[PDB]
Amino acid sequence: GGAGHVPEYFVGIGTPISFYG
Numbered sequence: 498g499g500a501g502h503v504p505e506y507f508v509g510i511g512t513p514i515s516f517y518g
Contacts, residue, residue, distance in 0.1 A: 498505045498517025505513040 499515045501517035503516055505517045
């Protein structure tokens with residue numbers, strides 16, 4: 498996400514570098 502709690506790391510690359518909620 499951006500400032501969430503759970504990691505939005507679902508992709509392999511380095512796109513998802515935040516957390517969602």
